[model samples]
Target chain A: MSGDNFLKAFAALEALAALPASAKELQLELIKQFMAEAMKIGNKEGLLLLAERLEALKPKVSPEIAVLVEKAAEMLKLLAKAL
Target chain B: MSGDNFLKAFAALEALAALPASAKELQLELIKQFMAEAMKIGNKEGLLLLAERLEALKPKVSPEIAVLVEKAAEMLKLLAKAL
Candidate 1:
């Protein structure tokens, strides 16, 4: 159960990095969903690592993703409890 | 008039290229304003050169800048009328 769920969340984040700026609306929604599942798995290292990946992608995505980035950051903040 | 205004527009684009991904929100709004002023000058060669500068910034700016890029592109497209 742990492996399956964590992999699903990680894969979503990976897919998100590949997605283009034109897909901004969907990107945020997807990021939100991934945060929920990834946190549920309680894998702080993996989550923080992927958060940096998300950080690199900010340069390539739309400005609208700013709010989503903050929201995503907020989600990762919860990992303070996990790590 | 053209000298004063084009300098303003070009300087804004220059400033934009130097702006970081963290300022994604302000970045887009400033880009839009620059595009409007830049287009109003009707200087195709200068506009095209600056447009290319904006393009180089893509790899550095936030994804949300994509729409502003598009809108800026459309504004530059009017250069078909200028050149």
Candidate 2:
């Protein structure tokens, strides 16, 4: 892709993934707030893509879930490439 | 992969990647400001990582230049993950 989608996707994950780091700073929180706004309008696949991206960042996220996230990123990357 | 490197890498890339998109708005421009600051004390490998990530985003960057950039990211991503 366009990374408009990638852009959108990372924006979602970055928001959630950086939470632990949030306790340490304000800029990250500001970015998180921006992503939260972006999410309400983000796509389903993008959101799912974000789920996996977040899993990688947040150890608090289930490893089992993270596996699914990469699986999903691969599937989505394929689907995106095919188009 | 701490993505702290990934974070720094893409923050570098994201700043550069979104430039074309920036012609359309201001928020993206603001991010570029942060990244510029980030570039200064970012790791040597991390800077290379950003170079590749930026290449992928900017076609005007030149095929020759972009190729080198991806090469750098691959090398850095490998090294960072190794760490």
Candidate 3:
């Protein structure tokens, strides 16, 4: 996936994980915003990844997106360090 | 050719124009720094553009780079506005 997509997907996962039962709505809002920004930047991959993550989470939180999120987080961390 | 290159070139032009006869040395140093940053970012276009502007300005400031600079300036302005 593209860097932008990875960033968006990772960010979404992070935001989602930040909220528990009571704040579910707030987490969803944040995820939406992140997706919007990624789209505005013309990051197609990001949008797809975000959508996939959201869909995967519909029934309940699952581990499927967890790996992707972890990988993205690691990559971003390295990028930040290098930068 | 690239956003990074254009940004570097435009920044160089701006930095150079900020200096006059007596401060020539400082301006060159700053230009070099900007070029280095662009390279670090892997912005080939930006680096090339920056180099081109520096080379074009060696004998004296020229109008070609000026036009290019203006274009980049406009682009950055728009990007800023959009952002």
Candidate 4:
């Protein structure tokens, strides 16, 4: 992806991290759907690596931010299990 | 912005957070340049508020991640001073 696009994706992750716990599950589901589609289009390894990196990131996250990382992990797991 | 674009920006932030402290200043400069152009095109308040939010985010960051936040803040200060 272009640097601009990458930055935009990073901003989305930040926005996601800022969401309330109550809203996280739904957003995570959406992220899963997006990632699944990306992987299906031949980005599977990249998707898995991205998930792994996010997992590594969990410890660095604060309580509020960790919720997003947790949600992202769960979403990725759901996608992987389905595959 | 499109949801895709927002997601891309969010991803950029995530990627930047993963950068080493040594590399943060350059990335911050780039982000600042991007924001300044965006503001010049009439997004000043949004740009400023975004910078403020990034500042608020500093405490949530790990030491490594905090460097990126610090760099981002410095870049914003530079832009504001220029304005």
Candidate 5:
């Protein structure tokens, strides 16, 4: 499940970005912190679960949705590689 | 237009929060920086413009959306007061 864990890390970030501009900052920031910790510790299960909390947020599937998606993914990937 | 500027600052944050989890971290962060600078310098015009870009983002009208919206607004408000 290493791949899944990695994917979830990316997906979790995607989920976080999907939040509204008026979205919860602390809670989401908490989630991001959790995801980072999970990655730091290589906790696959935690990463998966964190990703769940994020994915549960329903955003759009429109053509415009991807602009942020791709960018967030890029940032998370860079984060993953660095951290 | 102090009220509008303040409102735009909050609205811009809302727009930022609306981005996907996979959204552009650096770009968004840059936007956030611009916002903070605008706030610090009391740049109403800049704040309004930033809010425009953020407001331009189309997210959902779903009932669940406000969860993040209210929170981000709160944070920005706090930031406004402090900065």
Candidate 6:
């Protein structure tokens, strides 16, 4: 189940990162679902890894998604610190 | 512009709260946009008010939205603190 959550989280982020620049609303949806999936992993390593990847993906997404990605990474880092 | 951002933020949260439980993905999109709008407000009272409304909205949305709402509220509170 842990592995499952991690895989799902990564897949969700990757899918989000892959969205076309014009797909703002769809990108937000992907991000919402990705945040939910990432929260499920509940491991510091997974959370930090996801944050790192999100930071790396920042340049590739739309401006709106990049802003949300920053929030997502902040949330991930907070969750990791709470662990 | 300040009032515009606040009104939009409130509207976004209300729309998210109004969504049918089955429309989980849509709810998340609303949330993603709401957070972005809320961040634009940059007022402590506005941020706290948004967080308060989101807390009140907890019982109205789907479980997924509620979870995201908690994170959203936390983000709001943190933003308020940083102000």
The candidate that wins on DockQ is 4
Tens digit per residue, CA lDDT, model 1, A1-83: 23333444555666677788899878877777777776765455445555665676677667888667766766676674557
Task: Report the lDDT tens digits of candidate 3 across residue range B1-83.
Answer: 13333333445555675566456566556555554544443333333434444555554534444454345434434443444
Docking class of 1: incorrect
lDDT of each: 0.64, 0.44, 0.46, 0.49, 0.43, 0.74
Off by over 4 Å in 1: A1-83, B80-83
Please give the lDDT score at residue B5 for candidate 4: 30
What DockQ class does candidate 3 belong to? incorrect
- Ranking 1 against 2 by DockQ, winner: 2
lDDT at A76, model 4 = 59
Worst 10 residues of 3 chain B by lDDT: B1-10
Q: Which wins on TM-score, candidate 1 or candidate 2?
A: 1
The DockQ of each candidate is 0.01, 0.05, 0.01, 0.17, 0.02, 0.07
lDDT of 5 by residue, B1-83 (tens): 25544543444344345445444432244245435544553543444454444444425322344333344334445544554
List of chain A TM-scores, every candidate = 0.72, 0.39, 0.45, 0.45, 0.34, 0.88
Cα-based lDDT at residue A10, candidate 3: 55
| Superposed model 4: Cα runs more than 4 Å off | A1-33, A36-83, B1-42
Compose the digit string of candidate 5's lDDT tens values, residues A29-63: 63455355445534333333333434444253322
Predicted candidate 1: interface RMSD? Answer: 18.9
Query: The CA-based lDDT of model 6 is what?
Result: 0.74
Each prediction's TM-score against the native?
A: 0.45, 0.30, 0.29, 0.38, 0.25, 0.54
Best by lDDT: 6
Candidate 6: docking tier:
incorrect
What is candidate 1's TM-score against the reference? 0.45
| lDDT string, candidate 3, A3-65, tens digits | 654554455454454344343333344444444444443344444555455555444433444
Candidate 5 structure, TM-score to reference: 0.25
Alpha carbon deviation, residue B80, candidate 4 (Å) = 3.6
* Candidate topping TM-score: 6
- Candidate 3's displacement at residue A26, Å, is 36
> Model 2 residue A75 lDDT?
53
For residues A4-73, write the lDDT of model 2, one tens digit per residue: 4344445545554545542434434433453444344233444344444544554533444445445554
